[PDB]
Amino acid sequence: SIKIRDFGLGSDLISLTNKAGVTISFTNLGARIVDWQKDGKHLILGFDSAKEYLEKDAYPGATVGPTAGRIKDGLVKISGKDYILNQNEGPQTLHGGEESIHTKLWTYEVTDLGAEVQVKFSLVSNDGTNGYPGKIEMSVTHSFDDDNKWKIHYEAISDKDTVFNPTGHVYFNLNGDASESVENHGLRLAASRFVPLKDQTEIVRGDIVDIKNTDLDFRQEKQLSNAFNSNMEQVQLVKGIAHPFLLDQLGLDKEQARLTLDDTSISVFTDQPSIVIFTANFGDLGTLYHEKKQVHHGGITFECQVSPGSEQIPELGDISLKAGEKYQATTIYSLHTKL
Amino acid sequence: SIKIRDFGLGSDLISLTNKAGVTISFTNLGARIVDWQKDGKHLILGFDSAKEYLEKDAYPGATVGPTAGRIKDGLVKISGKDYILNQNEGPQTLHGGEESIHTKLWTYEVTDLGAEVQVKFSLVSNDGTNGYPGKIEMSVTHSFDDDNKWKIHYEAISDKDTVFNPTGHVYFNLNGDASESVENHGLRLAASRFVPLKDQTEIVRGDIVDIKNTDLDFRQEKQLSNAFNSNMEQVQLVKGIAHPFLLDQLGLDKEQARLTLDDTSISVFTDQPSIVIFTANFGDLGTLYHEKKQVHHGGITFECQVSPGSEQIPELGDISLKAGEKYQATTIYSLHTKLEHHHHHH
Numbered sequence: 176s177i178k179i180r181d182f183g184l185g186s187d188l189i190s191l192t193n194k195a196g197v198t199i200s201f202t203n204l205g206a207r208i209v210d211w212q213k214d215g216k217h218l219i220l221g222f223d224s225a226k227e228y229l230e231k232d233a234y235p236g237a238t239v240g241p242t243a244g245r246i247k248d249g250l251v252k253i254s255g256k257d258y259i260l261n262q263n264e265g266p267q268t269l270h271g272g273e274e275s276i277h278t279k280l281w282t283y284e285v286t287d288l289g290a291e292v293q294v295k296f297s298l299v300s301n302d303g304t305n306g307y308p309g310k311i312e313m314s315v316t317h318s319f320d321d322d323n324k325w326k327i328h329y330e331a332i333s334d335k336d337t338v339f340n341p342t343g344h345v346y347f348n349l350n351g352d353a354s355e356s357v358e359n360h361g362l363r364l365a366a367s368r369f370v371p372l373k374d375q376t377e378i379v380r381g382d383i384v385d386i387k388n389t390d391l392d393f394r395q396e397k398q399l400s401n402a403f404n405s406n407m408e409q410v411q412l413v414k415g416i417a418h419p420f421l422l423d424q425l426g427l428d429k430e431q432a433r434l435t436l437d438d439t440s441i442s443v444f445t446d447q448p449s450i451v452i453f454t455a456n457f458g459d460l461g462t463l464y465h466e467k468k469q470v471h472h473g474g475i476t477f478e479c480q481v482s483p484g485s486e487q488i489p490e491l492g493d494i495s496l497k498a499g500e501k502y503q504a505t506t507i508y509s510l511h512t513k514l
Numbered sequence: 515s516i517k518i519r520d521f522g523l524g525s526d527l528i529s530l531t532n533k534a535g536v537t538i539s540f541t542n543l544g545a546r547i548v549d550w551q552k553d554g555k556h557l558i559l560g561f562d563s564a565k566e567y568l569e570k571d572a573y574p575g576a577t578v579g580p581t582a583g584r585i586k587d588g589l590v591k592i593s594g595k596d597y598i599l600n601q602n603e604g605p606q607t608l609h610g611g612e613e614s615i616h617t618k619l620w621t622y623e624v625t626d627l628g629a630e631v632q633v634k635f636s637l638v639s640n641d642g643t644n645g646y647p648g649k650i651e652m653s654v655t656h657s658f659d660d661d662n663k664w665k666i667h668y669e670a671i672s673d674k675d676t677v678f679n680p681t682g683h684v685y686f687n688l689n690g691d692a693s694e695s696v697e698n699h700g701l702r703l704a705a706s707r708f709v710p711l712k713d714q715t716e717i718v719r720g721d722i723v724d725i726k727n728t729d730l731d732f733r734q735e736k737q738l739s740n741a742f743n744s745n746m747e748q749v750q751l752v753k754g755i756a757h758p759f760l761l762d763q764l765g766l767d768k769e770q771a772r773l774t775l776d777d778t779s780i781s782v783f784t785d786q787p788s789i790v791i792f793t794a795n796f797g798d799l800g801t802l803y804h805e806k807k808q809v810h811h812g813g814i815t816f817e818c819q820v821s822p823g824s825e826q827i828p829e830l831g832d833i834s835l836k837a838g839e840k841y842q843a844t845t846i847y848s849l850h851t852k853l854e855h856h857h858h859h860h
């Protein structure tokens with residue numbers, strides 16, 4: 176079943192319920208995921224109206240871009256030329272700059288396929304918007320099916336050579352409550368390397384590091400508290416995890432990651448080469464989710480994309496988008512329950 | 515009363531009914547007016563769904579900007595610097611550029627004041643968007659009251675020195691039928707001069723001309739057919755009217771224009787210095803409005819703003835907006851009945 180309702184400020188709430196009784200909700204404000212629930216329990220973090228996101232934290236569940244992550248000094252080079260993007264976190268351009276795409280009302284169309292329902296959100300980013308060459312016509316289709324697969328398919332075409340590398344910023348919390356650390360969940364991740372951060376500014380340090388046999392090797396499922404109680408300078412640096420992990424094997428068929436709590440597990444599939452993991456290291460901030468004060472470590476992201484820092488570490492990849500080339504990305508979050 | 519419902523593609527349709535029974539409705543797609551009816555008759559042109567605007571004509575009833583009209587070669591000078599804007603009409607920048615603000619979903623909040631209801635739409639134009647320095651925090655409030663006054667109030671603040679001069683693109687047609695020409699409407703307009711256009715590209719010629727005693731003199735009411743039938747060069751150039759009229763007396767207090775058909779009149783008030791009048795010179799295009807093929811001359815706009823061309827005719831005004839400075843503009847369209855005697859035939 177599909178239900179559409181007013182989410183506040185003119186945005187809509189589109190709720191989909193599959194054959195299994197599982198309900199996923201999205202809003203056009205930022206082409207985002209608002210809730211995901213089973214047997215009455217939220218699996219992800221989310222607010223109860225548009226205003227909240229605007230007032231509290233605009234990123235949760237949002238499609239962020241055009242470039243996800245931090246760009247040092249807001250500087251990219253396009254076809255040999257340097258371009259300075261909007262700078263919104265010191266000199267860095269973070270998630271596309273201020274008042275970026277996650278704060279806009281996207282247009283959308285719903286497509287009911289039966290076992291599968293698609294919600295296609297569309298937005299045009301004007302040439303020069305926040306310094307980005309365009310125009311860029313973007314669409315993000317979030318779909319939900321009877322097999323409990325929530326899939327995100329991105330597509331884009333630009334009139335000029337530009338940069339493009341968006342991501343989905345959903346925060347998972349299998350405890351169903353923000354006041355509860357995710358240190359009790361277990362994580363498995365098919366990555367033997369990561370990208371260390373230079374410092375508190377969170378720009379990349381410059382190198383690629385081997386994680387095998389360290390507190391960050393989740394190659395073998397392991398509990399989060401491990402990483403959390405590690406003395407590794409990198410962990411201590413951010414007070415948790417807030418880094419890109421390079422996947423060992425690329426391809427949409429491979430389960431790249433798994434997050435488990437009891438009988439409940441989320442499997443991550445993507446065609447992207449990297450996963451950025453941030454464990455809501457908010458300290459005492461205490462953002463309120465559903466009347467619950469959020470705790471340090473009260474959520475975790477799986478930002479699938481090309482790793483931030485390719486501006487200084489080219490090996491990471493190349494995020495350019497040539498005028499006329501069609502960009503495509505796919506990321507999937509599969510829900511499972513042991514019987 | 516106020517009613518809201520989905521209008522298509524994610525937009526809403528906000529419908530107000532005042533105490534007199536007059537209904538007006540807006541959509542956050544382009545912070546635009548969609549319809550205005552009296553006794554079941556449409557006083558304006560509009561479509562039935564959001565997709566119609568996107569597929570047929572995205573300008574009717576829309577808020578357009580950041581700069582309304584054509585900027586020759588998209589070139590503006592801001593604080594001694596030249597900036598080139600998006601060029602969407604040949605080398606010209608028409609109505610802020612391609613995929614401009616009239617194409618976006620604005621957020622909104624409704625305030626019920628009882629005798630007056632306000633719909634405040636908001637949008638942020640990012641710095642660099644279409645070439646304009648910013649960011650620009652914009653807001654358009656559309657309000658309707660028990661006195662049948664539809665009012666538009668614009669506010670804006672930029673982080674940087676930029677240019678701003680938006681307008682409202684409604685089209686009236688008192689026949690309530692697009693396939694009916696407005697040549698049968700009477701027009702009264704407090705303007706003695708106009709701005710001629712250089713040629714078919716529609717950029718300004720460079721001079722300001724006196725139109726008194728010509729077929730474009732509406733200081734004293736006359737049927738629109740007088741203009742439409744005129745063979746004056748400027749009229750033949752655009753096949754109707756499509757020019758800026760310079761108001762003789764400035765101020766929000768003055769009825770600068772009045773459009774009448776039989777017992778119904780629409781009065782125009784504004785704090786702007788000019789009214790750009792475009793009489794839907796589309797020839798045989800025949801855009802369908804409510805299933806009626808629109809006719810040449812099947813509608814008339816009253817775009818209140820600083821006249822286009824100030825880049826060339828500095829005398830028209832200054833559309834620059836300084837960083838931190840608050841822009842404001844107000845335009846009011848008020849409806850009346852039996853304001854005068856208008857009994858004609860065509």
Ligand SMILES: OC[C@H]1O[C@@H](O)[C@H](O)[C@@H](O)[C@H]1O
Pocket residue numbers: 234344377417418451452453476478
């Ligand atoms: O505070 C650091 C974090 O900031 C977030 O906005 C970002 O999405 C995370 O991946 C992480 O880098």
Ligand SMILES: OC[C@H]1O[C@H](O)[C@H](O)[C@@H](O)[C@H]1O
Pocket residue numbers: 573683716756757790791792815817
């Ligand atoms: O074609 C000329 C015409 O073009 C557009 O529709 C404008 O909005 C009108 O004001 C007028 O200048």
Ligand code: NA
Pocket residue numbers: 180181185186187519520524525526
């Ligand atoms: Na809605």
